[PDB]
Amino acid sequence: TVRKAGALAVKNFLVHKKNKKVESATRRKWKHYWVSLKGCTLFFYETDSVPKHAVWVENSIVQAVPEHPKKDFVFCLSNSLGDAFLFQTTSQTELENWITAIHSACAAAVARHHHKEDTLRLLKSEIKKLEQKIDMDEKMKKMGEMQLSSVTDSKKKKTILDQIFVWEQNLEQFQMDLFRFRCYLASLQGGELPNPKRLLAFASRPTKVAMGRLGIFSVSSFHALVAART
Questions:
Q1: What's the N-to-C CA distance of the chain in angstroms?
Q2: Integer Cα distance of 141 and 127 in angstroms
Q3: What totals of helices (H) and strands (E) does the chain contain, helices first?
Q4: Are 77 and 40 spatial neighbours (Cβ–Cβ below 8 Å)?
Q5: Which of 166, 170, 214, 219 could, after both became Cys, cross-link 63 (CB 3.0–4.6 A)?
Q6: Architecture of the domain delimited by 5-113
Q7: Based on the number of CB atoms within 10 Å of its own CB, is 128 exposed (0-12), middle (13-18) or buried (19 or more)?
Q8: What is the location of CATH 2.30.29.30 in the chain?
Q9: CA-to-CA dists, residue 190 to 126, 182, 193, 220, 226, angstroms
């Protein structure tokens, strides 16, 4: 079946090159296409009988993009790949659908991969435990800033900076993982996505620097470089 479908504005915005590395695609001016949202597959078929380019929208994350230059009404998906992509719709209404939609089919396959029945039951099951990962590691690393500081023996500082640039990048992953399960158990529920500010907030400095390599520390941005690691 098709969750929904129609015609959009395809312009790639960043992809996962080999060796964990995020980069802005070649300046391709917004292209055309039509497309239907079959479960996890986001097929794209041409003007006026077989799609001429695919997109397996798994676990991915779409954030609004009303920020973009001229062409108003804009979307933005972060592919489990580490890929970036940006579709431009007809109205904030259609902006709802494909978004609240896609976000659905994605979190959907999730319900499946984990062989569970109730949507919100998996989400809530993931939502909870996730933070548990937080406070335990969100502290585990804190505790180190509390020792590495008072320590001075060079060998126990290089093993500290370790489980830190380590616990920092496990922290990151974690939350950007929540904004998923949530902005998913949120579409599925009807209330607006969470706060895109809170998202960035807990985002790594070193990790932010890169978000500076490319462009605008974008919600998508730190959801992009985020997976190129995964």
A1: 30
A2: 21
A3: 7, 7
A4: no
A5: 219
A6: Roll (2.30)
A7: exposed
A8: 5-113
A9: 19, 12, 9, 21, 26
